[PDB]
């Protein structure tokens, strides 16, 4: 029959996302799991960036969080997220704006890069199918 | 200006879904990245399972893969994977049905439990916006 | 002029005790700091063992907490509580008797070993006054 | 039985004290475990402070150990001493004076500070009894 839609059921579907290619290109395989999850966490976040209207001038979204509230946003401690934001900035994936005075960073969460490997390979995973 | 479709884009908005109960609920404090990751694995292979149809009599959808299998798809080795499937099961996110012999285990992922708590969590979290 | 006896100090001079020869002593050179630390606070819960009546029949003053108990009380993840239980177990300063199920396992903090070389050590060390 | 005082207790009984409140207040959330503990292994440097009779004309307690001895002290390197110097000096849980030349700076370790909320949730914690 026709079921209703339940407030458990939105909640149940609500979730963080990490780019596939995390897993597949090797353009990243000094991406801690932490830090994977952390980029879907801030990923999920983009969108308080937008209403606090933390948008420049180009359009890009930032984050303008201090190191207290991003432990707070990641769950871990000081040294975790010293750990995490290194890793992205690492790989291209953060982009680090020290500000002067005892101001909040201003953080720019970066998309993925994907290559022909990375297409073939994510292609290959999903349509590997049971053999007739 | 309008924009094309490009394919790098498409497959860089490619993810794995992991459930946000898992980062608030009381419930799944046991599960590590590497259960979380592997879930979120599993929920997208769902997908090739309905292309399997690997679907039982009552509509659940189920799969039929060898621990080798189950290793290479979440990448892991032997012991890890022996690890995953415990965390999973011990939370009920994961039910196993023996067949013995030789004929692979039948595994039953499962969706999430959510609470009251869980809700209100991911609800203050969802809307935590920067006070005025 | 003699002085009150204020809260502010008295909360100031609480703290968490690590043994010194965790320092000194390369019998524990592989512990990390996070072991030393989560020593010392379950260390402090030794006074609640006593209260919640957690104690061996040979007088040994033993822990009974979940997971996620133990979790909340050294603020971390359920990896590292997975280290720190085996870095502490392996240099014999942590028992864990098992019971199996979902029943909490038996942890037992046990007090670190002191050589000679250790007691050398640190009385060198507190007493490395400027010469004159 | 009675039990006699044996030296190896005695030694075993000996630690270096970090304040409670550097886990629990939300004023040190961006003190490293490297900083906790520099910070304890200095307060139990105090002594020797007295020893060498590091007190200024207000009875304050300071050091004056050169980088290089800070370094062999904390059993840290020198970049690390750098950035534990910082976090503890900006969290006011250090204070520095310079004299200019090679003369080995002037430090003062401070005492931490303790809020209502600080208070609470220690309070809250050694009281957490089993139910």
């Given at each position: 029959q026709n079921q209703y839609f339940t407030v458990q059921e939105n909640y149940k579907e609500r979730f963080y996302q990490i780019p596939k290619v995390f897993f597949?290109?090797?353009?990243?395989?000094?991406?801690?799991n932490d830090m994977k999850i952390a980029y879907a966490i801030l990923r999920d976040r983009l969108n308080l960036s937008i209403k606090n209207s933390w948008v420049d001038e180009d359009g890009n979204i930032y984050f303008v969080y201090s190191n207290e509230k991003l432990m707070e946003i990641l769950n871990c401690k000081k040294e975790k997220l010293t750990k995490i934001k290194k890793g992205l900035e690492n790989d291209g994936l953060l982009i680090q704006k020290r500000r002067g005075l005892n101001k909040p960073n201003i953080l720019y969460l970066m998309k993925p890069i994907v290559t022909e490997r990375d297409i073939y390979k994510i292609e290959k995973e999903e349509n590997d199918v049971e053999p007739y």
């Open positions: 597949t290109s090797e353009n990243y395989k000094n991406l801690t």
